[PDB]
Amino acid sequence: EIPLKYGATNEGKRQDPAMQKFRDNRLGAFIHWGLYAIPGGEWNGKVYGGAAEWLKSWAKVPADEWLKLMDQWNPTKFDAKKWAKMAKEMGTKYVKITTKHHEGFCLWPSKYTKYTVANTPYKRDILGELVKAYNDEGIDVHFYFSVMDWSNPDYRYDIKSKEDSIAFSRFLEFTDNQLKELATRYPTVKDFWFDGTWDASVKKNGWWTAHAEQMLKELVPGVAINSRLRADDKGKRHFDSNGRLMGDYESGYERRLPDPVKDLKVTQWDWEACMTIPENQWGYHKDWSLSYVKTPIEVIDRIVHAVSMGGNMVVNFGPQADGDFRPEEKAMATAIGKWMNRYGKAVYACDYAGFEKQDWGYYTRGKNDEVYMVVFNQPYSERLIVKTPKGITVEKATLLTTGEDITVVETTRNEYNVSVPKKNPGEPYVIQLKVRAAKGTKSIY
Numbered sequence: 001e002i003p004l005k006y007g008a009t010n011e012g013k014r015q016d017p018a019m020q021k022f023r024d025n026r027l028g029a030f031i032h033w034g035l036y037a038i039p040g041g042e043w044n045g046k047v048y049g050g051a052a053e054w055l056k057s058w059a060k061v062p063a064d065e066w067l068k069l070m071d072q073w074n075p076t077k078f079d080a081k082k083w084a085k086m087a088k089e090m091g092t093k094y095v096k097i098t099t100k101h102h103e104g105f106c107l108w109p110s111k112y113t114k115y116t117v118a119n120t121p122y123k124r125d126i127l128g129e130l131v132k133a134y135n136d137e138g139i140d141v142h143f144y145f146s147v148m149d150w151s152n153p154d155y156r157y158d159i160k161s162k163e164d165s166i167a168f169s170r171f172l173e174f175t176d177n178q179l180k181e182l183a184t185r186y187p188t189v190k191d192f193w194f195d196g197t198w199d200a201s202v203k204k205n206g207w208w209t210a211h212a213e214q215m216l217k218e219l220v221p222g223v224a225i226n227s228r229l230r231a232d233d234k235g236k237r238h239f240d241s242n243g244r245l246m247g248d249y250e251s252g253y254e255r256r257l258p259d260p261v262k263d264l265k266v267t268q269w270d271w272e273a274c275m276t277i278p279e280n281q282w283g284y285h286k287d288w289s290l291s292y293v294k295t296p297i298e299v300i301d302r303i304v305h306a307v308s309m310g311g312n313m314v315v316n317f318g319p320q321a322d323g324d325f326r327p328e329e330k331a332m333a334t335a336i337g338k339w340m341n342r343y344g345k346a347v348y349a350c351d352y353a354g355f356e357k358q359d360w361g362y363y364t365r366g367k368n369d370e371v372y373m374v375v376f377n378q379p380y381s382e383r384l385i386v387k388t389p390k391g392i393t394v395e396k397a398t399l400l401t402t403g404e405d406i407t408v409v410e411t412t413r414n415e416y417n418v419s420v421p422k423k424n425p426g427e428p429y430v431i432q433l434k435v436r437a438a439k440g441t442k443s444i445y
């Protein structure tokens with residue numbers, strides 16, 4: 001055991017109501033919106049294949065010239081109520097918004113820098129508008145915040161001199177100032193999701209990460225803080241030198257997911273995954289023909305996969321420079337929403353079920369020990385294998401949409417064939433199970 005002043009604080013999962021809400025929400029949307037939406041992956045006639053929100057980096061653009069894009073920031077089709085409606089319709093319970101990305105342009109009128117929405121033709125506090133509009137729809141709002149800031153010359157990638165250290169110390173104060181500002185300007189915020197924290201400068205300043213966490217928790221009761229923020233005394237990130245999770249939830253599954261057989265450890269803590277629709281574009285990119293674009297079922301698969309393992313999933317959108325969403329994104333949100341409106345009882349407020357993974361799809365567990373079978377791969381055998389943990393029996397199966405009864409046949413001790421429905425639902429579908437735990441078993445149930 002190593003002693004630490006800046007390692008983990010939470011013993012296991014938080015169980016206060018605010019965390020239970022963060023968790024029960026399950027499905028979120030991510031919004032990456034910034035100056036990068038203007039060029040949309042293209043600089044001086046060259047279309048770059050890299051992530052559009054990193055175009056400043058791919059095209060080697062200097063800060064002064066990149067930030068002049070502010071002069072073209074005028075999203076005339078922006079309407080926060082419309083965005084909130086789109087999210088509501090998709091079935092998202094929360095939205096995570098880029099308050100400031102690496103480029104350092106702020107979507108709120110920060111008093112600590114000139115690189116904000118206030119100094120654009122549009123002028124308006126976009127972030128405040130969104131907060132209000134989402135909240136009015138009953139949607140929680142989470143703030144993405146990039147510590148790394150390409151707009152501020154006090155930023156350092158590493159601390160290699162006393163000068164570096166003096167500059168970076170000012171930078172951290174500047175950062176603290178922006179964070180306090182967001183927390184006090186927008187007190188309905190439920191979560192801060194830190195990015196751009198991997199540089200050696202931040203690793204060397206573990207103490208600050210812990211302080212940022214504590215500071216925000218004092219300012220916003222019940223607020224959640226992601227693991228990606230945190231470095232310990234030794235510079236170890238996410239999990240401290242004693243293997244303990246820092247922050248309130250684990251936030252490293254980005255465009256990938258834990259293996260449903262080999263990575264069951266994740267069920268021990270809260271966590272959130274995020275994903276993109278194309279392969280690797282977060283900000284708006286004008287040409288989606290350059291990589292694989294996920295279909296709605298492929299996205300729904302990932303959402304359910306996450307919930308089946310006790311995690312959240314956040315699906316990313318990269319709005320156009322005009323403040324509308326491209327057609328592929330409107331289609332996606334609508335398709336997701338349609339499915340969730342039908343089958344969302346197996347997603348919202350659900351969790352890991354403790355059953356062995358089977359090939360047909362995923363289990364999720366409801367608040368009242370409902371066990372949902374979410375079927376993505378339909379067996380030609382017409383039988384869905386269900387192997388129960390020790391002491392658990394299956395008493396009934398019911399097709400969720402119709403209430404029709406589904407035959408359950410015992411094949412061995414602890415295993416059943418659950419029949420597929422008589423009519424093929426023709427889309428991923430849910431069978432709700434009623435299970436019973438014997439007197440004197442172990443496990444939840």
Ligand SMILES: C[C@@H]1N[C@@H](c2cn(-c3ccccc3)nn2)[C@H](O)[C@@H]1O
Pocket residue numbers: 051053054195198254274282
């Ligand atoms: C949530 C996603 N995180 C950002 C990211 C992080 N990185 C990155 C780049 C180099 C090293 C480590 C991480 N690249 N892009 C993406 O631009 C987006 O905000």
